[PDB]
Amino acid sequence: VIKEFMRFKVRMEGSVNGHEFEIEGEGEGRPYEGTQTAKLKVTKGGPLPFAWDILSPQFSKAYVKHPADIPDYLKLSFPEGFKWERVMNFEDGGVVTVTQDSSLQDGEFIYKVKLRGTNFPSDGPVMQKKTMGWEASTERMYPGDGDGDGEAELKGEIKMRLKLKDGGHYDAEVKTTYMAKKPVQLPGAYKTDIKLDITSHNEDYTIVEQYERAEGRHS
Protein backbone atom coordinates (compact mmCIF):
# COMPACT_ATOMS: atom_id res chain seq x y z
CA VAL A 1 0.00 0.00 0.00
CA ILE A 2 3.06 2.26 0.36
CA LYS A 3 4.11 3.06 -3.20
CA GLU A 4 7.48 4.48 -4.24
CA PHE A 5 5.79 7.90 -4.54
CA MET A 6 3.22 8.92 -1.92
CA ARG A 7 1.27 12.10 -1.23
CA PHE A 8 -0.08 13.24 2.12
CA LYS A 9 -2.49 15.77 3.56
CA VAL A 10 -2.05 17.33 7.00
CA ARG A 11 -4.12 19.43 9.40
CA MET A 12 -2.78 20.93 12.62
CA GLU A 13 -4.76 22.63 15.37
CA GLY A 14 -2.65 24.21 18.04
CA SER A 15 -1.99 26.93 20.55
CA VAL A 16 1.32 28.48 21.61
CA ASN A 17 1.30 30.67 24.74
CA GLY A 18 -2.48 30.77 24.38
CA HIS A 19 -2.43 31.91 20.72
CA GLU A 20 -4.75 29.52 18.83
CA PHE A 21 -4.21 28.67 15.18
CA GLU A 22 -4.96 26.15 12.43
CA ILE A 23 -2.78 24.97 9.56
CA GLU A 24 -3.66 22.91 6.50
CA GLY A 25 -1.09 21.46 4.16
CA GLU A 26 -0.12 18.85 1.62
CA GLY A 27 3.07 16.98 0.93
CA GLU A 28 4.65 14.29 -1.19
CA GLY A 29 7.78 12.22 -1.27
CA ARG A 30 9.54 8.92 -1.82
CA PRO A 31 9.10 6.79 1.31
CA TYR A 32 11.81 4.25 0.48
CA GLU A 33 14.31 6.98 -0.45
CA GLY A 34 13.70 8.95 2.77
CA THR A 35 12.82 12.27 1.11
CA GLN A 36 9.72 14.44 1.21
CA THR A 37 8.40 17.98 0.81
CA ALA A 38 5.47 19.78 2.41
CA LYS A 39 3.59 23.01 1.73
CA LEU A 40 1.75 24.43 4.75
CA LYS A 41 -0.75 27.30 4.94
CA VAL A 42 -1.90 29.10 8.11
CA THR A 43 -5.68 29.11 7.67
CA LYS A 44 -6.67 30.61 11.05
CA GLY A 45 -4.85 32.62 13.69
CA GLY A 46 -2.14 34.03 11.44
CA PRO A 47 0.28 35.51 10.96
CA LEU A 48 1.65 33.39 13.78
CA PRO A 49 3.09 35.45 16.65
CA PHE A 50 5.91 32.95 17.21
CA ALA A 51 8.71 31.16 15.37
CA TRP A 52 7.65 28.76 12.58
CA ASP A 53 10.59 26.55 13.53
CA ILE A 54 8.82 25.07 16.59
CA LEU A 55 6.11 23.70 14.24
CA SER A 56 8.29 22.41 11.41
CA PRO A 57 9.27 19.06 13.04
CA GLN A 58 5.59 18.21 13.57
CA PHE A 59 4.73 18.14 9.84
CA SER A 60 6.06 12.16 8.70
CA LYS A 61 8.01 9.07 9.69
CA ALA A 62 6.60 6.79 6.99
CA TYR A 63 9.23 8.49 4.77
CA VAL A 64 12.37 7.27 6.56
CA LYS A 65 14.70 5.15 4.45
CA HIS A 66 15.41 1.91 6.32
CA PRO A 67 17.90 -0.84 5.47
CA ALA A 68 16.44 -4.28 4.92
CA ASP A 69 17.69 -5.59 8.29
CA ILE A 70 15.99 -2.94 10.44
CA PRO A 71 12.21 -3.56 10.68
CA ASP A 72 10.34 -0.50 9.39
CA TYR A 73 7.71 -0.54 12.14
CA LEU A 74 5.94 2.61 10.97
CA LYS A 75 5.74 1.54 7.31
CA LEU A 76 4.52 -1.91 8.41
CA SER A 77 1.71 -0.32 10.42
CA PHE A 78 -0.15 0.74 7.27
CA PRO A 79 -2.84 0.93 5.93
CA GLU A 80 -4.17 1.28 9.49
CA GLY A 81 -1.26 3.50 10.50
CA PHE A 82 0.10 4.75 13.78
CA LYS A 83 -0.11 7.50 16.38
CA TRP A 84 2.66 9.48 18.00
CA GLU A 85 3.01 11.63 21.11
CA ARG A 86 5.90 14.04 21.62
CA VAL A 87 7.27 16.36 24.31
CA MET A 88 9.87 19.01 23.44
CA ASN A 89 11.54 20.71 26.42
CA PHE A 90 13.38 23.87 25.36
CA GLU A 91 16.32 25.14 27.39
CA ASP A 92 14.53 28.33 28.54
CA GLY A 93 11.52 26.44 29.90
CA GLY A 94 9.21 26.48 26.89
CA VAL A 95 7.41 23.19 26.24
CA VAL A 96 5.73 21.82 23.12
CA THR A 97 3.46 18.78 23.45
CA VAL A 98 2.14 17.11 20.32
CA THR A 99 -0.23 14.27 19.51
CA GLN A 100 -0.66 12.95 15.99
CA ASP A 101 -2.68 10.37 14.06
CA SER A 102 -1.44 8.91 10.76
CA SER A 103 -3.65 6.84 8.47
CA LEU A 104 -3.88 5.91 4.79
CA GLN A 105 -7.02 6.79 2.84
CA ASP A 106 -7.66 6.90 -0.92
CA GLY A 107 -3.99 6.09 -1.58
CA GLU A 108 -2.66 9.06 0.43
CA PHE A 109 -1.42 9.47 3.97
CA ILE A 110 -3.64 11.55 6.24
CA TYR A 111 -2.07 13.35 9.20
CA LYS A 112 -3.97 15.01 12.05
CA VAL A 113 -1.85 16.98 14.52
CA LYS A 114 -2.74 18.59 17.86
CA LEU A 115 -0.14 20.86 19.41
CA ARG A 116 0.20 22.85 22.63
CA GLY A 117 3.13 25.17 23.34
CA THR A 118 3.41 26.69 26.79
CA ASN A 119 5.66 28.84 28.95
CA PHE A 120 7.80 30.37 26.22
CA PRO A 121 9.41 33.54 27.63
CA SER A 122 7.75 36.60 26.12
CA ASP A 123 11.20 38.04 25.31
CA GLY A 124 12.66 34.72 24.16
CA PRO A 125 13.65 33.75 20.62
CA VAL A 126 10.47 31.76 19.94
CA MET A 127 7.98 34.50 20.81
CA GLN A 128 10.24 37.15 19.25
CA LYS A 129 10.73 35.20 15.97
CA LYS A 130 14.52 35.19 16.30
CA THR A 131 15.25 31.67 15.05
CA MET A 132 16.83 30.52 11.80
CA GLY A 133 16.23 26.80 11.25
CA TRP A 134 17.28 23.50 12.81
CA GLU A 135 20.68 21.90 12.64
CA ALA A 136 20.69 18.32 11.38
CA SER A 137 19.65 15.89 14.12
CA THR A 138 20.04 12.25 15.09
CA GLU A 139 17.07 10.51 16.72
CA ARG A 140 17.97 7.56 18.93
CA MET A 141 15.30 4.87 18.60
CA TYR A 142 14.59 2.02 21.00
CA PRO A 143 11.69 -0.29 21.96
CA GLY A 144 9.97 0.68 25.19
CA ASP A 145 6.55 0.87 26.81
CA GLY A 146 5.22 4.40 26.36
CA ASP A 147 1.54 3.90 27.22
CA GLY A 148 1.35 1.69 30.33
CA ASP A 149 -0.04 -1.47 28.74
CA GLY A 150 3.12 -3.46 29.48
CA GLU A 151 3.95 -3.90 25.78
CA ALA A 152 6.78 -2.07 24.06
CA GLU A 153 6.17 0.56 21.39
CA LEU A 154 8.83 2.52 19.47
CA LYS A 155 10.48 5.42 21.32
CA GLY A 156 12.80 8.13 20.06
CA GLU A 157 15.00 10.70 21.79
CA ILE A 158 16.58 13.73 20.10
CA LYS A 159 18.89 16.54 21.20
CA MET A 160 17.91 19.32 18.78
CA ARG A 161 19.57 22.68 18.17
CA LEU A 162 17.94 25.74 16.61
CA LYS A 163 20.11 28.44 15.02
CA LEU A 164 19.51 32.01 16.24
CA LYS A 165 19.09 34.88 13.77
CA ASP A 166 21.30 37.20 15.81
CA GLY A 167 24.03 34.58 16.28
CA GLY A 168 24.07 31.58 18.59
CA HIS A 169 22.00 28.46 19.20
CA TYR A 170 18.99 27.38 21.26
CA ASP A 171 18.50 23.79 22.39
CA ALA A 172 15.58 21.42 22.92
CA GLU A 173 15.34 17.88 24.32
CA VAL A 174 12.69 15.76 22.59
CA LYS A 175 11.02 12.46 23.50
CA THR A 176 8.49 10.77 21.21
CA THR A 177 6.53 7.51 21.41
CA TYR A 178 5.35 6.00 18.11
CA MET A 179 2.50 3.49 18.39
CA ALA A 180 1.37 1.20 15.59
CA LYS A 181 -2.39 0.58 15.30
CA LYS A 182 -1.93 -3.16 14.67
CA PRO A 183 0.68 -5.72 15.82
CA VAL A 184 3.86 -5.31 13.79
CA GLN A 185 7.51 -6.18 14.33
CA LEU A 186 9.51 -3.73 16.45
CA PRO A 187 13.19 -3.12 15.66
CA GLY A 188 15.96 -3.12 18.18
CA ALA A 189 17.75 0.12 18.96
CA TYR A 190 18.96 2.16 15.98
CA LYS A 191 19.35 5.80 14.94
CA THR A 192 17.77 8.06 12.33
CA ASP A 193 19.67 10.95 10.77
CA ILE A 194 17.29 13.80 9.90
CA LYS A 195 17.73 17.17 8.21
CA LEU A 196 14.79 19.54 7.76
CA ASP A 197 15.05 22.69 5.64
CA ILE A 198 12.63 25.54 5.09
CA THR A 199 12.98 25.88 1.32
CA SER A 200 10.67 28.86 0.82
CA HIS A 201 8.24 31.01 2.75
CA ASN A 202 6.32 34.21 2.37
CA GLU A 203 7.39 37.11 4.54
CA ASP A 204 5.13 36.31 7.49
CA TYR A 205 5.40 32.49 7.34
CA THR A 206 1.74 31.93 6.47
CA ILE A 207 2.72 29.88 3.38
CA VAL A 208 5.77 27.70 4.01
CA GLU A 209 7.53 24.91 2.10
CA GLN A 210 9.71 22.31 3.83
CA TYR A 211 12.04 19.54 2.69
CA GLU A 212 13.22 16.66 4.88
CA ARG A 213 15.67 13.80 4.33
CA ALA A 214 15.70 11.01 6.92
CA GLU A 215 17.56 7.70 7.00
CA GLY A 216 17.71 4.94 9.58
CA ARG A 217 21.00 3.21 10.27
CA HIS A 218 22.56 0.86 12.77
CA SER A 219 23.80 2.41 16.00
State which residue, 69 or 149, has the beta carbon closest to Ca ion.
Answer: 149
State which residue, 139 or 153, has the beta carbon closest to Ca ion.
Answer: 153
CA distances from residue 84 to 56, 61, 146, 209 in whole angstroms, order as listed: 16, 10, 10, 23
Interacting stretch for Ca ion, rule CB under 5 A, among 37-45, 94-102, 152-160, 165-173? 152-160
Count CB neighbours of 168 within 10 A. Answer: 11
CA–CA separation, 116 and 179 (whole Å) = 20
Residue 151 sits in the site that holds Ca ion (CB under 5 A): yes
State which residue, 135 or 145, has the beta carbon closest to Ca ion.
Answer: 145
Interacting stretch for Ca ion, rule CB under 5 A, among 1-9, 64-72, 96-104, 144-152? 144-152
CA–CA separation, 8 and 4 (whole Å) = 13
What is the x/- site pattern for Ca ion, positions 97-136, by CB under 5 A? ----------------------------------------
Q: Find out whether 173 and 89 touch, Cβ atoms under 8 Å.
A: yes
Residue closest to 9 by CA, chosen among 109, 80, 115, 79: 109
Smallest gap, in angstroms, from Cβ of residue 147 to Ca ion?
Answer: 4
Q: Find out whether 111 and 125 touch, Cβ atoms under 8 Å.
A: no
State which residue, 135 or 147, has the beta carbon closest to Ca ion.
Answer: 147
If you ran DSSP here, which 8-state letter would residue 106 be given?
A: T
> How many whole angstroms from its chain centre is CA 202?
21
Q: How many residues bind Ca ion (CB under 5 A)?
A: 5
Smallest gap, in angstroms, from Cβ of residue 141 to Ca ion?
Answer: 15
Smallest gap, in angstroms, from Cβ of residue 101 to Ca ion?
Answer: 14
Length of the chain: 219
Phi, psi of 195, rounded to the nearest 5 degrees = -140, 125
Residue 80 sits in the site that holds Ca ion (CB under 5 A): no
Residue 147 sits in the site that holds Ca ion (CB under 5 A): yes
Residue nearest to Ca ion (CB): 145
Binding residues vs Ca ion (CB under 5 A): 145, 147, 149, 151, 153
